[PDB]
Structure 1
Amino acid sequence: DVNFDLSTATAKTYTKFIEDFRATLPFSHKVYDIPLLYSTISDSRRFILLNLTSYAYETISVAIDVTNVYVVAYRTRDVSYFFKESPPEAYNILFKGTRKITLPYTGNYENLQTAAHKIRENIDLGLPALSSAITTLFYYNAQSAPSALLVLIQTTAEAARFKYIERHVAKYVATNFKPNLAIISLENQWSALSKQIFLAQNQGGKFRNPVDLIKPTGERFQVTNVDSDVVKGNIKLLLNSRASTADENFITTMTLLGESVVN
């Protein structure tokens, strides 16, 4: 579990939150000396909660998946709501007693994109913007609600995914500024680059499949090796998305404590 107070949010504090955040969830292995999540972790530990405090000294709880680190749902006051097609398993571990409401929307950006009729490029961002997120959820506004939590995903879930996103979000501690196409392409590419990062181990620093993303400047560039700025101290925890071997459903599901056969 991790806690972040917006009322006392600060650039240095934002850094501590992301470092503690990557340390909060387990680690399947170490890639380039950095944390990472296997295909799936323990369900009891898969769901972690974040205690966030609005600049109004109000406190809410956010539940996210340890692997991709995306908010499945969140709890406000005594009511917690989640999307569909995946988050419902939340009924099992997340909220236990508080009210429960799942919006007809699925835990997908396209579903929220249609309801909000907006794009991340047109959504405001910045520490203070987070106040709008925590603040809006307390005043759950059908239209903003979707855009409110989305800001939280970009400021909390995405911030932990990359230190680069954390830097741009941490730079704003009072004003509000809309994101940039750099995070958009970078967000989708991160997944392809992250799995390739594990591959970078046997490529000496090259990717078998080159990666095309967008530099924070606002232009599109091609990255094919660790020499790129993204692989530098910009990548902390990575998504292993490793489970193809899980096809045999044995190296997994057959872990059978039998290992350590002795006794």
Structure 2
Amino acid sequence: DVNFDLSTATAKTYTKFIEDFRATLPFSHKVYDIPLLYSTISDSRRFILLNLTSYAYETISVAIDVTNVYVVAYRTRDVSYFFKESPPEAYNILFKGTRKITLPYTGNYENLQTAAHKIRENIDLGLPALSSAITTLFYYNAQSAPSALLVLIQTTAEAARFKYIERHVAKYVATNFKPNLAIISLENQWSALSKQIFLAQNQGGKFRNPVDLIKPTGQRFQVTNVDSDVVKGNIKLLLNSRASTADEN
């Protein structure tokens, strides 16, 4: 699986974890050089596992849906906790033999957020903060869980979607930070960005609809071409065509 052990980790081993994780994902072909992810995949290949150990050697294994980089479930020791409203497949092929519990919330930011009474703009990301969520996830408790899960997906799934986010957490290695407004907006927008870069093949570069983002400082701008600085060296994983278009952005 894609390994990352916090007990040996530096800004270097963290980018390599992300770099490796970006490259066990199957994609069908690079759209504007951003790998585009399969809408449909033989369930044998559906899920990839990330192998996360903390400073103090708590190993949890978390499952990623390659079809959309979502985290679907996670195993601690030999209990295995699934999001409410997972893939059915996930339940069959994954963590066989473990008592399998279904967390009371779906895995999406606005649920997670509720269960946590705490929007992620108030939750310290960072490499120390990762290695803590792993401790509060290993030793599961329904109070602790949901905010620990907020930390886990942003420092891994969104890091692999957006190099802006990968870079930020590579910066904070012996300290934590907070989502700046730009990291949030990339987060809330990977999908509309995927839908429009997909469309923007047909009209030779330009978006069909514009995508609205916010600078760290609070300045609302918009990107509207695959030329723009966000598309151009930032985005690294494209949302599967079916998922990205069903929703109007």
TM-score (norm 1): 0.87
Task: Check the 8 A contact 1:38/1:242 in 2, yes or no.
Answer: no
Report the Cα distance in structure 2 between the residues aligned to 1:200 and 1:140, rounded to whole angstroms. Answer: 44
Structure 2: give runs of 5+ residues left out of the alignment.
none
Task: Check the 8 A contact 2:6/2:54 in 1, yes or no.
Answer: yes
- How many residues are aligned here? 249
Report the Cα distance in structure 2 between the residues aligned to 1:246 and 1:155, rounded to whole angstroms. Answer: 27
TM-score (norm 2): 0.91
Task: Check the 8 A contact 1:126/1:175 in 2, yes or no.
Answer: yes
Task: Check the 8 A contact 1:6/1:53 in 2, yes or no.
Answer: yes
Task: Check the 8 A contact 2:137/2:148 in 1, yes or no.
Answer: yes
Distance 1:227 1:217, change over 3 A: farther
Report the Cα distance in structure 1 between the residues aligned to 2:169 and 2:218, rounded to whole angstroms. Answer: 16
The offset of 1:61, in angstroms, is 0.5
* Deviates most, 97-106 or 152-161: 97-106
The offset of 1:89, in angstroms, is 3.4
Task: Check the 8 A contact 1:198/1:240 in 2, yes or no.
Answer: no
Q: 2:134 aligns to what?
A: 134
Spell out, residue by residue over 1:126-174, the C-alpha distance to the aligned partner (whole angstroms, 9 max, x if none): 0110011101112213212111012101111111111111011111111
Task: Check the 8 A contact 2:58/2:138 in 1, yes or no.
Answer: no
Q: What's the secondary structure of 1:43's corresponding residue?
A: coil
Q: What's the secondary structure of 1:104's corresponding residue?
A: coil
Report the Cα distance in structure 1 between the residues aligned to 2:6 and 2:84, rounded to whole angstroms. Answer: 29
Bigger radius of gyration: 1
The offset of 1:217, in angstroms, is 4.3
Spell out, residue by residue over 1:3-52, the C-alpha distance to the aligned partner (whole angstroms, 9 max, x if none): 11111222222221222112102111111223221213222211111111
Task: Check the 8 A contact 1:87/1:107 in 2, yes or no.
Answer: no
Report the Cα distance in structure 2 between the residues aligned to 1:122 and 1:21, rounded to whole angstroms. Answer: 26
The offset of 1:245, in angstroms, is 10
Q: 1:121 aligns to what?
A: 121
Structure 1: give runs of 5+ residues left out of the alignment.
250-263
Q: What's the secondary structure of 1:7's corresponding residue?
A: helix
Percent of residue pairs bearing the same amino acid type: 100
* Deviates most, 236-245 or 55-64: 236-245
Spell out, residue by residue over 1:205-238, the C-alpha distance to the aligned partner (whole angstroms, 9 max, x if none): 2112111112344422111112321111101121
Report the Cα distance in structure 2 between the residues aligned to 1:83 and 1:237, rounded to whole angstroms. Answer: 23
The offset of 1:112, in angstroms, is 2.0
Distance 1:60 1:214, change over 3 A: same
The offset of 1:60, in angstroms, is 1.5
Distance 1:248 1:202, change over 3 A: closer
Distance 1:33 1:49, change over 3 A: same
Q: 2:92 aligns to what?
A: 92
Distance 1:243 1:123, change over 3 A: closer
The offset of 1:87, in angstroms, is 4.3
